[PDB]
Amino acid sequence: ELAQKVMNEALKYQGWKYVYGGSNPNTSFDCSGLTQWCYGKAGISLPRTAQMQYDATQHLPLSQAKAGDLVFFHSTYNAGSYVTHVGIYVGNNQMYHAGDPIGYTDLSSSYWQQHLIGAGRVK
């Protein structure tokens, strides 16, 4: 149920431009702004940053992940925190994320595999 609620919201922003600092439809979204907003619509309260969201979830490999789990990554840009990116797992090795434009990407790629930290299940 969670996945369908989060993604019904997230799909409204498919193709939108990434905006740094964005956390609502009025501004558009950054990676963890998209997840915070969409999970919020589904009744889950998440913290604002990708790192904070990582630390609020229970972790599991991508092979065990289910749609509606989050997926986290390291070393995607020059950051103080270990976690540098988050997106939404939607099954079949795909994630939906911001992302520029916002939308789907395939996690099977070497790039995502090598930046992967793991998946996280929300509380």
Residue numbers in the entry: 212 to 334
Manuscript text:
The structure of CdCwlT33800CD2 was successfully elucidated and refined to an Rcryst of 0.184 (Rfree of 0.215) with a good chemical geometry using 1.45 Å resolution data. There are two molecules, Mol-A and Mol-B, in an asymmetric unit, related by non-crystallographic twofold symmetry. The structures of the two molecules are almost identical within root-mean-square deviations of the main-chain atoms of 0.42 Å, and the structural description here concentrates on Mol-A, giving a relatively clear electron density to the whole polypeptide chain. CdCwlT33800CD2 was spherical with five helices and eight β-strands. A large β-sheet comprising six antiparallel β-strands (B3, B4, B5, B6, B7, and B8) was noted at the center of the molecule. An α-bundle-like structure with three helices (H1, H2, and H3) and a small β-sheet formed by B1 and B2 were located on one side of a large β-sheet, while two helices (H4 and H5) were present on the opposite side. A large substrate-binding groove was detected at the center of the molecule, and a large β-sheet formed the bottom of the groove. The catalytic residues Cys242 and His296 were located at the center of the groove, facing each other, and Cys242 was oxidized to cysteic acid. The B1–B2 and B6–B7 loops formed the sidewall of the substrate-binding groove, while the B4–B5 loop formed another sidewall. The electron density of the B4–B5 loop of Mol-A was poor, while that of Mol-B was invisible in the final electron density map, suggesting that the B4–B5 loop was in dynamic motion.
